[PDB]
Amino acid sequence: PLDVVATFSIIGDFAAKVGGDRIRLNVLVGPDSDTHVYEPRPADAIALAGADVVLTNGLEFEGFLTRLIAASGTDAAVATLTDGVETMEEPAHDPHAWQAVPNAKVYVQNIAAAFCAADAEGCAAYQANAARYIGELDALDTEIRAAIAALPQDRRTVVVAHNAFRYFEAAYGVHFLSPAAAADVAGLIREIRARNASAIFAENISDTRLLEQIAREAGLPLAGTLYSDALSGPDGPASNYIAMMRHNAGAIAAALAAR
Ligand SMILES: [Zn+2]
């Protein structure tokens, strides 16, 4: 059994689909948790020390990783799953490439390659798993594109907790606003009014601080929760990547349809 560590939950779901019962999977950053602020527990160094393969996002998403690799003394092969992805410059590259379904296909192919490197005998099983999961991703990508196409182009703007959806925007044509640092909420609400934003969404990885505040001051409904950088727990509505994207796509579409 191939010993695999995935840095966070979204990647961990891809690994489970490619590897099936051939791998033993450990995921560092869990559901409803923020990788941007993650600090590795000493248990994580043990996980890395025992792994054959480490699956990471790259693009500086996991700031803790290079330290953990040296502290753990691991000799694991480290796969950067955004290898080969058309990345986007950040307002440094924007790490949230999984929000566009064609990029998730590339993640999945890089995982199969990483497993093939470490376990040649299983390569055909891994590639069969990947090709099957990639079929479901292509259909998911078609559903999302069509549902956003079925919306009038004048209401396509939603508000979110952080700038995590720029690849979704680029792929699908929904624009996202989010607060930043400081306290320029007045500037946000102005832009909310300028762009006629339909809805404010919470995020599963963040406290619903301001987002309730902004929704009141903007006079908009808090329409629900979007899953940005982490899956939900197993009995939440985003327990795997495909469920997460259909939840997000349906929640956004419902909010954009209510004028
Ligand atoms: Zn993020």
Q: Which two tokens stand for residue 156?
A: 């396509």
Ligand 1 centroid distance, CA of 76 (Å) = 26
Q: What was the elucidation method?
A: X-ray
Residue 210 to residue 84: CA distance in whole angstroms:
37
What are the sequence ranges of the domains in the chain? 1-137, 140-259
Nearest to 51 by CA among 106, 1, 112, 103: 1
247 is in an annotated binding site: no
Cβ density class 203-230: b for 16+ within 10 Å, e for less: bbbbebebbeebbeebebebbbbbbbbb
Q: What does the DSSP 8-state code read for residue 63?
A: T
Report whether 8 contacts 35 (CB < 8 A): yes
Provide, for the chain, the percentages of residues in helix, strand and coil under a 3-state DSSP scheme, each rounded to the nearest 5.
Answer: 50, 15, 35
Ligand 1 centroid distance, CA of 128 (Å) = 31
Q: Which value, to the nearest 10 degrees, does the dihedral of the CA atoms of residues 251, 88, 83, 75 take? A: -90
Ligand 1 centroid distance, CA of 165 (Å) = 8
Nearest to 212 by CA among 221, 232, 204: 221
Under DSSP, is residue 37 helix (H, G, I), strand (E, B) or coil?
A: coil
Which residues have a Cβ under 8 Å from the Cβ of 75 and sit 6 or more positions away?
none
**Beta strand extents in the chain (DSSP E only):** 2-8, 23-29, 53-56, 77-80, 157-159, 175-177, 199-203, 222-226
Ligand 1 centroid distance, CA of 36 (Å) = 6
Residue 96 to residue 42: CA distance in whole angstroms:
26
Residue 249 to residue 81: CA distance in whole angstroms:
24
Q: Which two tokens stand for residue 117?
A: 């490197």
Under DSSP, is residue 140 helix (H, G, I), strand (E, B) or coil?
A: helix
Nearest to 25 by CA among 115, 105, 123: 115
Report whether 200 contacts 159 (CB < 8 A): yes
CA dist list (Å): 228 to 23, 151, 211: 26, 22, 15
96 is in an annotated binding site: yes
Nearest to 19 by CA among 127, 139, 137, 103: 127
- Give the DSSP H/E element, type plus range, for residue 155: none
CA dist list (Å): 34 to 2, 216, 256: 27, 26, 27
Ligand 1 centroid distance, CA of 230 (Å) = 9
**Beta strand extents in 41-191 (DSSP E only):** 53-56, 77-80, 157-159, 175-177
Residue 29 to residue 65: CA distance in whole angstroms:
12
Under DSSP, is residue 219 helix (H, G, I), strand (E, B) or coil?
A: coil
Q: What does the DSSP 8-state code read for residue 89?
A: B
Q: What does the DSSP 8-state code read for residue 93?
A: B
229 is in an annotated binding site: yes
Side chain identity at residue 239, one-letter code: S
